[PDB]
Amino acid sequence: PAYRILKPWWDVFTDYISIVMLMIAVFGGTLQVDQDKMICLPCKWVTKDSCNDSGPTGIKYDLDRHQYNYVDAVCYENRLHWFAKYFPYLVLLHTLIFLACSNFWFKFPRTSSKLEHFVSILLKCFDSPWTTRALSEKEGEQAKALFEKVKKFRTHVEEGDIVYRLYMRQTIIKVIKFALIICYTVYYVHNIKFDVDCTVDIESLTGYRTYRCAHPLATLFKILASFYISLVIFYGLICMYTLWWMLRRSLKKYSFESIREESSYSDIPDVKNDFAFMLHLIDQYDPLYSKRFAVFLSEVSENKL
Amino acid sequence: PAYRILKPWWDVFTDYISIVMLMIAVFGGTLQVDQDKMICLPCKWVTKDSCNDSTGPTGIKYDLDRHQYNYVDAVCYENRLHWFAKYFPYLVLLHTLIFLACSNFWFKFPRTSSKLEHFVSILLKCFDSPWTTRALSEVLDKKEGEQAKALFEKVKKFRTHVEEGDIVYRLYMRQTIIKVIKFALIICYTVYYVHNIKFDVDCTVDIESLTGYRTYRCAHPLATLFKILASFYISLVIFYGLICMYTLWWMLRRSLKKYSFESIREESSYSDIPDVKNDFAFMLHLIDQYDPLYSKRFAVFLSEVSENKLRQLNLNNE
Amino acid sequence: PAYRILKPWWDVFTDYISIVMLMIAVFGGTLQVDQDKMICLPCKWVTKDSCNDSTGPTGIKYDLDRHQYNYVDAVCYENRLHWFAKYFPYLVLLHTLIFLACSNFWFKFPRTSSKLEHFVSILLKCFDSPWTTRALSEGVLDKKEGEQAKALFEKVKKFRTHVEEGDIVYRLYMRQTIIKVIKFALIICYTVYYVHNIKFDVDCTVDIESLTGYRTYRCAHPLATLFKILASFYISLVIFYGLICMYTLWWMLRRSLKKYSFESIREESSYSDIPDVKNDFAFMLHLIDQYDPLYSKRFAVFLSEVSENKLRQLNLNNE
Amino acid sequence: PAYRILKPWWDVFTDYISIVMLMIAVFGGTLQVDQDKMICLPCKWVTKDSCNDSGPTGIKYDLDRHQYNYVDAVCYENRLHWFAKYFPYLVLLHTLIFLACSNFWFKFPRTSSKLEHFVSILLKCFDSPWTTRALSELDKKEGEQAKALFEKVKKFRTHVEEGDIVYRLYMRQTIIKVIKFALIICYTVYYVHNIKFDVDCTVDIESLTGYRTYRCAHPLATLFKILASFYISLVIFYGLICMYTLWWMLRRSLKKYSFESIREESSYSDIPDVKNDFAFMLHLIDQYDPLYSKRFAVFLSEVSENKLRQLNLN
Amino acid sequence: PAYRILKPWWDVFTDYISIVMLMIAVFGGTLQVDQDKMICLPCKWVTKDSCNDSGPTGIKYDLDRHQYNYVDAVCYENRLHWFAKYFPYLVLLHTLIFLACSNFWFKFPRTSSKLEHFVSILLKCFDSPWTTRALSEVLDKKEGEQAKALFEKVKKFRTHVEEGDIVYRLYMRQTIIKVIKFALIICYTVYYVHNIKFDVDCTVDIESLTGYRTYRCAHPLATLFKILASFYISLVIFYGLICMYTLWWMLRRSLKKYSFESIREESSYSDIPDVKNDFAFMLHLIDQYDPLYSKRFAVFLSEVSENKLRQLNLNN
Amino acid sequence: AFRVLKPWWDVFTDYLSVAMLMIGVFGCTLQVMQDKIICLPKRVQTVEMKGLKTDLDLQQYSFINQMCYERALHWYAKYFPYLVLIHTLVFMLCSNFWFKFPGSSSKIEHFISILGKCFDSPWTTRALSEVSKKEGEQAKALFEKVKKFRLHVEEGDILYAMYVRQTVLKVIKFLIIIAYNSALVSKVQFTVDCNVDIQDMTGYKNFSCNHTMAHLFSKLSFCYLCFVSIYGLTCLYTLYWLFYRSLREYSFEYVRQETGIDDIPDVKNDFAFMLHMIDQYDPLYSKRFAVFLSEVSENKLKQLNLNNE
Incomplete structure (x- = not known):
């Protein structure tokens, strides 16, 4: 939308990456809904509460189809790892929290209104042509009114740094959530196994104590888990870099030294707090916009006007 | 859309929160429709209608057809599974739909919808008006002066039309109160009945004439999943309630039916802005909660001194 | 959109309410399409077309195939489970479609749709017109708004002659309300009469002994308690809809909607020459008053000959 | 969209081609989710842990339905090629990588901003009345817009010629696409032949089933082979197109743009030689439509500035 | 859309028609994906591996459900015809190629740019007030300047598009490809539409796994795949007929020269020269949709109208 | 529409x-x-x-x-x-x-255009009130448009x-x-x-x-x-x-009873049929257009235009 800048x-x-994590979550959730089951067969030879594993003819278990379904449900509930x-x-859940x-x-009304006003007047100042003559060093009334709007917005935005602290908090939350996610996923990814050994003690209802189950959507889940880890790893790296960038320099102190040194208007003062951080983000997206806007922040440009 | 203000x-x-509760409602609905079964196996060792729970192992022969099994499932799902x-x-x-309603x-009740639409139109037109910018500074063209005079009169007519009424504030009162009561009832009955969602249940429905067994042990497979969903739902509702609770406090810590413009009248030169009351005051309070600048530059259109200054500026221009 | 007024x-x-009832209908339709079955078990011991109901327990062997069970299900579902x-x-x-129609x-009947669309256009165009604001305020003005206001003034006068002659909109709205209230009465009668027939356990005596071997089967309808809950919710929604329609009928019958008086308007405003319009025009003015009195307040100045005298004098000064 | 030019x-x-590949990928994914299985029947007669396979009456394998399901799942996991x-x-995944x-x-902010601001200048130059007058060879408002657009054009020329980030990005994207096409083709062509209908699985579940070797029919085998052949053909087309694009970049220096032809055909013979990133974008807009470049280039001549200033005063 | 002209x-x-065959495609694909099976029963008594076909009691085949599924899969994949x-x-696939x-x-950029420019200037001429004034045969000075500008655009666009004929060549090429493809579809479909049968005998030699040699299957969605195919064929024929008419419209008149003789006779400006190549073909297509657009655009192409507008702007 | x-x-x-x-x-x-x-x-x-x-x-x-x-x-x-x-x-x-026929849709668009124009034309109501300047020039232009439509549509039978x-x-x-x-x-x-x-x-x-x-x-x-x-x-x-009723001929005798003018020629064929259509939609349009169909009304309009000129 209007926040692309x-x-x-x-x-x-x-x-x-957040939108591609959501795809594997919906794909996995569809898999979990549709065909996430466990085909469990009883172990006739059992030794020490485990399967002894000790022409050819099939082995009769004398179990009904419903007994098999009950065994499947009980071993899926009790002896399949929760991961x-x-x-x-x-x-x-993690993807939704990342998106939130x-x-x-942009959804919090204070920062939403502040960012919206900054974007609106930055765009309408970019549409202004008098910045061309400024950087070279009825239309006059429009430039003066936009100058007044810019100054009165600055006097309102430079007082506080709500946007900067909120962005810091969001990025720190993202990096710590990435750390927790990668840690617990690396810990519990090996618990996704195709073959599992369930022991639920339903001998009264079935006649067998131990069963050996096969989980179909394990390997798929396994590779999905690996894929997720990869995405999370990449995500964390970017977040890590963001931390470093937001700790590289004082983002709350934007210095216009290069622009005021290049242009004739050297009276441009140092911007502070949310306006400074937002101009830093503008510099990151496009250094052209900050340089083009800087001339209306200078009062000797109004002296030219 | 334009009502975000x-x-x-x-x-x-x-x-x-209503969106995510609706999402879990839909997800639970598909789970319930598709794969909410109840695998029931008869208890062959009945001890006064109770499951006794008592050389290769051999499977237990129940001599039950697949359709007798399905009948047992249906009857013990209808009778013995808890309604929660x-x-x-x-x-x-249903609760999410009630919250959304x-x-x-x-915005759906026609009188309050019309009042809010008029307020949005007037406030936006004042926000984009050039004259207030000059009013914030302390020239205008003939067309700009004419439309500023028209906007001044429109603001006067809106103040006459809206400030007399009090339907909007009462409606927001009633909506907040109903949401708080709904949250309290939801939390009460939910947290009371969540523990009834269990995996293993014992069913005794007396179909011995049709099946041959009196008691059965059933395993509701989705129950644990539903349990965590219930827990998740509770958490969402809790947050919802707390948020609604804050709204109630924000709607009882002060009389929102009386807006005082002392801050603007001591900040700007114009010290004659009348204090506005009732629905106008409440909507301006909400606008202040969104962005104080909107009401800040709306205040200049309520002062008769600013109107006289605009008229004098128009006379100077012409 | 524009008709919301x-x-x-x-x-x-x-x-x-109709949206919610349509959602109920759709949900029940997919439920019936997907999982509406009837699990039927034969009665081993029968006593004159009735089940007799007479060391570990052993399951009853019925000697029926899966397909014989499916046949019994289909036959008992068709024959014995109630049509409701x-x-x-x-x-x-079907009821929601009738209500929505x-x-x-x-809105879709063209004889009234033309009147409604024209009234919507002229009402909004009078609401955002600046002559209304100037007239309600009570010099010099722009040309373009000059002939815009003059065209609005003559088009309102012609639209008054086009609508006041007939009462088709009022008659159509009255007929729609009457049909809706009698439909609500019929629905809330027959639904509450046949709502108790949605039972879980249903006994079927379908006489297919030549194919299956049994005569009486005790079936269980799975989507019966859920269907009873849906029917109760539908009955509650229909009760609310009928109460709202009876309120609409009382609103239409208490006051003659074919006579709208501007006595309050002509007293508050300077213009006391505004006439008391009647018939369909009075009807949609009453509807607008139910939405918002401000639209009628702004439009009423365009009915006064004093306002058009002032507008003509100002236009003559302008030209 | 705005980047259509x-x-x-x-x-x-x-x-x-990527849209079609994504469509067949979604088709195959839904097919593998819903209807993919394998029907496995045990080999009653064996010869050294193999399948001997030595009115007619059906063979009784004496297996339950769930033993058959277990056999199917275990043979699907163990003995069936991963392709x-x-x-x-x-x-x-390959289609998503190609699409990304x-x-x-258009998503990297520096290049996205460059292309967007270039698109804005090109559009308003195509709709510029002074472009029309310069092509033929003045209102004060149109003259003001013309002077503003001239200044925007020259400041853009200064701003984009300093660094060729867009050219390097496009070259790297084409190189990555060509390499991905090559890798996809070799591994897919190598691994298509492993999609067979009949597969023999010796998975050693004799303790649970009673049989050692089984013969499985894979139902979605010929359909998967047909989809693989269709994917191979689509990737052939994609790779040939990408190889042509790479040849187009490499045969001639796109970092230099000689305006000799346009400055010779058109009246203005003082048109500067556009170089580096601006040259790359002008080559792209030439590949779309030479008329856009011809109607934008009238704003690069300093002679037209002198005519514009003179006509502004007059 | 804006290209409907x-x-x-x-x-x-x-x-x-292509939309309807897309509907056929999606319906048949859903049917084939969901409910396309092949129930096969063994022939208990066989004479030389052919079914003999010699109260009553049911025949016991002694086959499990999984053996039946294996037989169904093998006789579906080895003996049911590929059509x-x-x-x-x-x-x-054919519907997608027809749409492509x-x-x-519509998508190829070299002709797409010409189409955008032609549609833009036609829409500007349709909404131009001086176009209506000249069709009716005192102006705004800026409107007159814009009218002279659009005259210049008409001349430069003439010089732009008259030099090439890629648009007409492209349209003829797609028409020829559609005709050839329709012929191929009709031929192979009328050949193979009789292969869709209900009762199919299969002989797959899986006696080692099931115990039976020959089976008889009944493909469920055969007749419903039959009539659809036949009805599909019908649509294709109509498509081909329409395409063939277009081919006739390629050769009935030379689209590379489109004369203005009717336009100049009915109008006051009996001076206009003819157009050629892509302009001629595009004006033919405009006449196919509505001749009023071409007749209205004709007043922006003549030199007498240019002189009249020059004199009017001198007065204006 | x-x-x-x-x-x-x-x-x-x-x-x-x-x-x-x-x-x-x-x-x-x-x-x-x-x-x-x-x-x-x-x-x-x-x-x-x-x-x-x-x-x-x-x-x-x-x-x-x-x-x-x-x-x-x-x-x-x-x-x-x-x-x-x-x-x-x-x-x-x-x-x-x-609705989809090209010539028929062109005729329908022309008819709805002229009928909406004369409905929006003040001279229709002015003449209706009179019997029972610039706008006069627009009325004369609309009347010659009426004559053009009569010569263009009424003779057809499609x-x-x-x-x-x-x-x-x-x-x-x-x-x-x-x-x-x-x-x-x-x-x-x-x-x-x-x-x-x-x-x-x-x-x-x-x-x-x-x-x-x-x-x-x-x-x-x-x-x-x-x-x-x-x-x-x-x-x-x-x-x-x-x-039941011949839509080849539309009788304007109801306008003759309402409006004092009597030299109103009855429309014929598709003109009658489309006026029957719009009468089913809204007869006010037809009775208001009928005074714009009479040539005696045209002569009176010419007389008033010459008087104003």
Whole structure:
């Protein structure tokens, strides 16, 4: 939308990773809904509460189809690791929290209004042609009114730094959530196994104590898990870099030294707080916009006007 | 759309919480429709209608057809499964729809919808008007002066039409109260009945004439899943309730039916802005919760000194 | 969109209730399409077309194949399960379609649609006109708004002659409300009469002994309690819809909607020459008053000969 | 969209090929989710852990339905080539990689801003009345817009010629697409023949089933082979198109744009030689339509500025 | 859309037909994916591996459900004809190729730019007030300047498009490809539409796994795949007929020269020269949709109208 | 927009066709997934009842099911939704035959343009009030437009005739649909008898089947039959209105009674037919245009224009 200017390469590209995490969550959730079962066969030879594993003819188990279904349900509920059962839901939850954390910047009304006003007047100042003559160093009334609007917006925005602290908090939440996700997923990815050994003690209702189950959507889930880890790893790296960038320099202190040194208007003062951070984001997206807007922040440009 | 200015952070948060509750309602609905079965196996060791739970192992022969098994499943799902475990997604869907109706009844009721539409139009036209910019600074063309005079008179007529009424504030009162009561009832009955969603149940429905067994052990497969969904639902509702609770406090810590313009009248030169009351005051309070600048530059159109200054500026221009 | 000014709170309420009832109908339709079955078990011991109901327990052997069970299910589902439990979602959908057609008939019927569209256009164009603001405020003005206001003034005068002669819109709205209320009465009668026939356990004596071997089967209808809950919710929604329609009928019958008086308007405003319009024009003005009195307040100045005298004098000064 | 002018025939052909590949990937994915299985029957007669296979009466294998389901699942997991199982996810992933590589041009903020602002100048120059007057060879408002657009054109020329980020990005995207095409072709052509209908699985579940070797029929085998052949043909087309694009970039220096032809045909013979990134964008807009470049280039001559200033005063 | 003026009645009819065959494709694909099976029963008594076909008691085949599924899969994959299995996919592929041939004129950038410019200038001429004034045969000065500008655009666009004939060549090429493809579809479909049968005998030699040699299958979605195919054929024929008419319209008149003789006779400006190549073909298509657009655009192409506008602007 | 020329019967048939298409779509979805037949062999092989054992596998049962579905079931019960879809698509395509014709649509656009222009023209109301400047110039231009439309449209004869063809086609299609549906609606029944000769495959030759969706298809067939009946009454009344009053000639004697002018020439052929259309829509437009049709009114307008000039 109108916030594309306020979306640097880390914001847009992690959003693409966020939208591709959601695809494997929906794909996994569809798999978990449709055919996530366990085909369980009883172990006739059992030794020490485990399967002894000790022309040819088939082995009669004398079990009904419904006894088989009951064995499947009980061993799926009791002896399948919870990561294998609830991996897609966990991925969906993490992705939804990532989306909420990356969009609450634009949904929170205070920061939403501040960013909207900055974007609107930045665009209408970019549409202004008098910046061309400014940087070279009825239309006059329009330039003066836009100058007044820019100054009165600056006097309102430079007082506080709500946007900067909220963006810091969001990025820190993203990186710590990435750390938790990668840690617990690496810990519990090996629990997704095709063959599992269930022991549920339903000998009264079935006649067998131990069964050896096969989980069809394990390997698929396994590779999906690996895929998820890869995405998360990439995500974390970007978030890590974001931390470094937002700790590289004082983002709350935008210095216009290069622009005021290049142009004739050297009276441009240093911007502070949310306006400074937002101009830093503008510089990240396009240095042209900040340089082109800087001339209306200078009062000797009004002296020219 | 254009009514986003009237939605504070609590309204946006409750809208998103309603969206996610609707999502889990739909998900539970598909699970309930598709794969809500009840695998029931007869207990061959009955001890006064109780499952006794008592050289290669051999499977237990029950001598039951597949259709007798399905009949047992259907009867023990209808009789012995608790109604919460069967109608949790539908109840959650109904509660989410009630919450959404309470939220949007403000914009759907024709009188309050018309009042809010007029307020949005007047406030936006004042926001984009050039004259207030000059009023914020302290020239205008003939066309600009004419439309500024028209907007001044439109603001006067709107103040006459709206400030007399009090339907909007009462409607928001009633919606917040109903949402709080609904949250309390939801939390009460839910947290009371969540523990009835269990995996292993014992069913005794007396179909011995049709099946041959009196008691059966059933395993509701979705129950554990539903349980976590219920827990998740509770968490969402809790947040919803807390947010609604804040709204109630924000709607009782002060009389929103009386807006005081002392801050603007001491900030700007114009110190004659009259204090506005009733629905006008409440809508301006909500606008302040969204963005104080909107009401800040709306205040200049309420002062007769600014109107006289605009008339004098128009006379100077012509 | 533009017609929202002709829908008061009762019409919006009925529209949303109809949406919810249509959702109920769709949900029941997919439920019936997907999982409406009837698990039937034969009665081993029978006593004159009735089940007799007479060391570990052993399951009863029926010696019936899966296909014989399916045949018994189909036959008992067709023959013995009540028609209400079979056609409840379709009946609900049909009733919602009738209700939605009744509510939106006058919007699609062209004889009234023309009047409604023209009234919408002239009302909005009078509402956003600046002559209304200037007249309600009570020099010099622009040319373009000059002939715009003059065209609006003469088009309102011609539209008054085009509508006041007939009462087709009022008659159509009255007929729609009457049809809706009698439909509600019929639905809330027959649905509450046949709502108790949605039972879980149904005994079927279908006489297929030559194919299956048994005569009486005790079937269980799975989607019976859920269908009973859906029918109760539908009955509640229909009760609300009928109460709203009876309120609409009382609103239409208490006050003559074919006579709208501007006595309050002509007293508050300077212009006391505004006439008391009647017939369909009075009807849609009453509907607008139910939506918002401001639209009628702004439009009423365009009915006064004093306002057009002032406008003609100002236009003569302008030209 | 707005970047339609920046998409030549090769780009749009690759876009439709990617859309078709995504369609068949979704088709195969739904097929593998719903109808993919294998019907496995045990070999009653064996010869050294193999399948001897030595009115007629049916063979009684004495297996339950669930033993058959277990046999199917275990043989599907163990003895069935990974290509036949994960081919839909492979084509889906490759199509997504191709689509991301093609659309990374318009999503990277520096290049996205450059292309967008270029598109704005090109559009308003195509709709500029002073472009029309310069082509033929003045209102004060149109003259003001003309002077503003002239200044925008020259400041854009200064702003984009300093660095060739767009050219390098497009070259790297084409190189990545060609390499991906080559890898996809070799591995897919190598691994198509492993999608067979009949597969013999010796999975050693004799303790649970009673048989060692089984013969399985894979139902979605010929359909998967046909989809694989269709995917191979589509990737052939994609790779030939990408190889042509790479040849187009490499045969001639797109970082230099000689305006000799346009400055000779048109009246203005003082048109500057556009170089580096601006040269690359002008080559792209030439590949779309030479008329856009001809009607934009009238704003690069300093002679037209002198005529514009003189006519502004007059 | 905004390109409907270049789409004649045959083009929109082909679009509608291709939409219907897309519906056929999606319906057949859904049917084939969901409910396409092949129930096969063994022939208990066989004479030389042929079914002998010699109260009553049911025949016991002694086969499990999984053996039946194996038999169904093998006799579905080895003996059912490929046309019955892959008819909806072939229909989808042919429909997609037909749509691609229809829109290759629409998406190919070299001709697409010419189409955009022609549609833009036609829409500008349709909404130009001086165009209506000249058709009626005192102005705004800026309007007169814009009218002279659009005259200049008409001349430069003439010089732009008259030099080439890629547009007409492209349209003729897609018409020829559509005709050839329709002939191929009709030939192979009328050949293979009789292979879709209900009762199919299969001999797959899986006696080692099931115990039976020959089986008789009944393909469920055969007759419903039959009539659809036949009805599909009908649509294709109509498509071909429409395409053939277009081919006739390629050779009845030379589209590379489109004369203005009717336009100048009825109008006051009896001076206009003829157009050629892509302009001529595009004006032919405009006449196919509506001659009023071409007649109205004719007043912006003549030199007498240019002189009249010059004199008027001198007065204006 | 040509909805103004659309009368109430046309839009009524439009919503009826939409409902018919919805019924056909629902029936097709039923046929896709819920359509199944269940066949049990006939003559198999306080009291106790024992089930009859058919000694048949599940695959023999499925083979019997589909062998009796293909043969024993009537073709109407299997292809009713597809026939409904085909007939409703033909109805929808035929519903706007009179709307989609190029020359006819050009005439309709011209007629609605001139009628809206004269309705918006102040001189219509001014002359109506008088009998019972710049705007005079616009009135004279509109009057010569009236004369041009009279010379361009009235002499033709395509509109009424082709409307009659469309109505006749609709009536004939309705009659055929009702006849075949009433003839084949008794074929849709629950229990059927299947006598296929698969004795060499299943041991039995006579089967009793039930079609599980026969009741719903019967209800859908009756609903579609009643919809077609309503459509047919609509088209029959349209035929009655077309043939009872001659739309080749429109009498303006009601305007002659209302407006004092009497030298109003009666319109003829398509002019009369389209004025009948707009009279069905709104007769005010016709009675207001009739004063713009009289040449004596033109002479009076010329006299007043010369006086003002």
